[PDB]
Amino acid sequence: SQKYSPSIPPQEEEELLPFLNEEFVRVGQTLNDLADGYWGVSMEPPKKLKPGTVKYFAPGVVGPVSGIYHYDLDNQWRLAGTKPKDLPGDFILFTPQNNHQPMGTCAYRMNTAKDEVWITMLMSGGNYTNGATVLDLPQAYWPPAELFIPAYSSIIPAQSTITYPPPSDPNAPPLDQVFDVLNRATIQTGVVNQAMFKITANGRVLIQGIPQGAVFGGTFTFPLVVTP
Amino acid sequence: SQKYSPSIPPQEEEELLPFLNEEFVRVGQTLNDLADGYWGVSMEPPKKLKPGTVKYFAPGVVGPVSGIYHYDLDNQWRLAGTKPKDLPGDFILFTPQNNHQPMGTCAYRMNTAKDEVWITMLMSGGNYTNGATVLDLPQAYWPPAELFIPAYSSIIPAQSTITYPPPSDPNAPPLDQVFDVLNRATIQTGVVNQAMFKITANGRVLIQGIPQGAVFGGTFTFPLVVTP
Amino acid sequence: SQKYSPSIPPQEEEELLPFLNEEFVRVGQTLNDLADGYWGVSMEPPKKLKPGTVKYFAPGVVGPVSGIYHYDLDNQWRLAGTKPKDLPGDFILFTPQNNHQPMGTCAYRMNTAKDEVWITMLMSGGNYTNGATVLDLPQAYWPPAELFIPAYSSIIPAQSTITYPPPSDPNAPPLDQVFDVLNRATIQTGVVNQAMFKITANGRVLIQGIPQGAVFGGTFTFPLVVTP
Which of B53, B70, B210 should we substitute to test contact with C (largest number of C Cβ atoms within 10 Å)?
B53
Which of A47, A55, A69, A148 should we substitute to test contact with B (largest number of B Cβ atoms within 10 Å)?
A148
CA–CA separation, C132 vs C142, rounded Å? Answer: 18
Which chain A residues are within 8 Å of C69, Cβ to Cβ? Answer: none
Residue C73 neighbours by CB distance under 10 Å: 9
CA-closest candidate to residue B125, choices B100, B154, B157: B100
CA-closest candidate to residue B80, choices A78, A60, C52: A78
Q: Does residue C122 contact residue C143 with C-beta atoms inside 8 Å?
A: no
Which of C1, C21, C31, C53 should we substitute to test contact with B (largest number of B Cβ atoms within 10 Å)?
C31
Q: Does residue B123 contact residue B106 with C-beta atoms inside 8 Å?
A: yes
Asked if residue A100 is part of any domain, the answer here is yes
CA-closest candidate to residue C105, choices B44, B223, B108: B223
CA-closest candidate to residue B207, choices B193, B194, B195, B222: B195
Instruction: Nearest by CB to C80, from B81, B114, B148: name it.
Output: B81
Residue C173 neighbours by CB distance under 10 Å: 11
Q: Does residue B111 contact residue B117 with C-beta atoms inside 8 Å?
A: yes
Beta bridge pairs of residue B30: none
CA–CA separation, C75 vs C69, rounded Å? Answer: 11
Asked if residue B172 is part of any domain, the answer here is no
Beta bridge pairs of residue B70: B78
CA–CA separation, A149 vs A120, rounded Å? Answer: 13
Q: Does residue B199 contact residue B147 with C-beta atoms inside 8 Å?
A: yes
CA-closest candidate to residue A221, choices B130, C117, C55, C67: C117
**DSSP symbol at A152:** E
CA-closest candidate to residue C196, choices C153, C159, C156: C153
- Which residues does A31 contact at the CB level (< 8 Å), separation at least 6? B31, C4, C27, C30, C31
Phi, then psi, of B150 in degrees rounded to 5: -65, 150
Q: Does residue A133 contact residue A206 with C-beta atoms inside 8 Å?
A: yes
The one-letter code for the residue type at C136 is D
CA–CA separation, A50 vs A28, rounded Å? Answer: 29
SS3 B75: coil
Which chain B residues are within 8 Å of C160, Cβ to Cβ? Answer: 160, 187, 189
Instruction: Sort strands A116-124 and B204-208 into parallel, antiparallel or unpaired.
Output: unpaired
Angle of helix A174-183 relative to helix B174-183, nearest 10 degrees, comes to 20
CA-closest candidate to residue B205, choices B115, B116, B130: B130
Asked if residue B138 is part of any domain, the answer here is yes
Q: Does residue A175 contact residue A121 with C-beta atoms inside 8 Å?
A: no
CA-closest candidate to residue C119, choices C224, C228, C225: C224
CA-closest candidate to residue C91, choices C219, C189, C200, C217: C219
CA–CA separation, B92 vs A13, rounded Å? Answer: 84
Q: Say how many residues make up chain B.
A: 228
Expressed as residue numbers, the domain containing B150 is 92-157+192-223
CA–CA separation, C151 vs B174, rounded Å? Answer: 50
Asked if residue C149 is part of any domain, the answer here is yes
CA–CA separation, A197 vs A217, rounded Å? Answer: 10
DSSP A38-104: B-----S---S--TTB---B-SSSSSSS-B--B--SS---B-SS----------EE-PPSTTPEE-S
CA–CA separation, C170 vs C62, rounded Å? Answer: 101
Q: Does residue C53 contact residue A37 with C-beta atoms inside 8 Å?
A: yes
Least CA distance to B190: which residue of chain A? A189
In angstroms, the separation between the Cα of residue C99 and the nearest Cα of chain A is 26
How far is the CA of B108 from the CAs of B118, B137, B227, in angstroms? Answer: 6, 9, 19
In the 3-class helix/strand/coil scheme, how is C73-126 assigned residue by residue? CCCCCECCCCCCCCCCCCCEECCCCCCCEECCCCEEEEECCCCEEEEEEEEECC
Instruction: Nearest by CB to A153, from C3, C173, C194: name it.
Output: C194
CB-based burial, A30-55: b 16+ in 10 Å, e otherwise: bbeebbeeeebebeeebeeeeeebbb
CA–CA separation, B214 vs B211, rounded Å? Answer: 5
Q: What is the CATH classification number for the domain harbouring B121?
A: 2.60.40.1830
CA-closest candidate to residue A100, choices A69, A133, A61: A133
CB-based burial, A76-92: b 16+ in 10 Å, e otherwise: ebbbbbbeeeeebeebe
CA–CA separation, B154 vs A209, rounded Å? Answer: 8
Asked if residue C148 is part of any domain, the answer here is yes
| Experiment type | cryo-EM
**DSSP symbol at B161:** E
Residue C178 neighbours by CB distance under 10 Å: 24
CA angle C122, C124, C130 (to 5 degrees): 95
Q: Does residue C49 contact residue C71 with C-beta atoms inside 8 Å?
A: yes
Phi, then psi, of B173 in degrees rounded to 5: -60, 150
Instruction: Report resolution (Å) to 1 decimal.
Output: 4.5
Distance of CA B120 to the CA centre of its chain: 15
Asked if residue C128 is part of any domain, the answer here is yes
Residue B66 neighbours by CB distance under 10 Å: 20
Q: Does residue C22 contact residue A24 with C-beta atoms inside 8 Å?
A: no
Computed over its alpha carbons, how large is the radius of gyration of chain B? 40
CA-closest candidate to residue B205, choices B153, B156, B154, B146: B146
Asked if residue B105 is part of any domain, the answer here is yes
CA–CA separation, B213 vs B126, rounded Å? Answer: 8
Q: Does residue A147 contact residue B120 with C-beta atoms inside 8 Å?
A: yes
Asked if residue C153 is part of any domain, the answer here is yes
Number of domains in chain B: 1
Phi, then psi, of C93 in degrees rounded to 5: -75, 135
Beta bridge pairs of residue C123: C102, C216
Alpha helices in B143-194 (DSSP H): 174-183
CA–CA separation, C163 vs C159, rounded Å? Answer: 13
CB-based burial, C138-170: b 16+ in 10 Å, e otherwise: eeebbbbeebbbbbbbbbbbbebebeeeebeee
Q: Does residue B132 contact residue B207 with C-beta atoms inside 8 Å?
A: yes
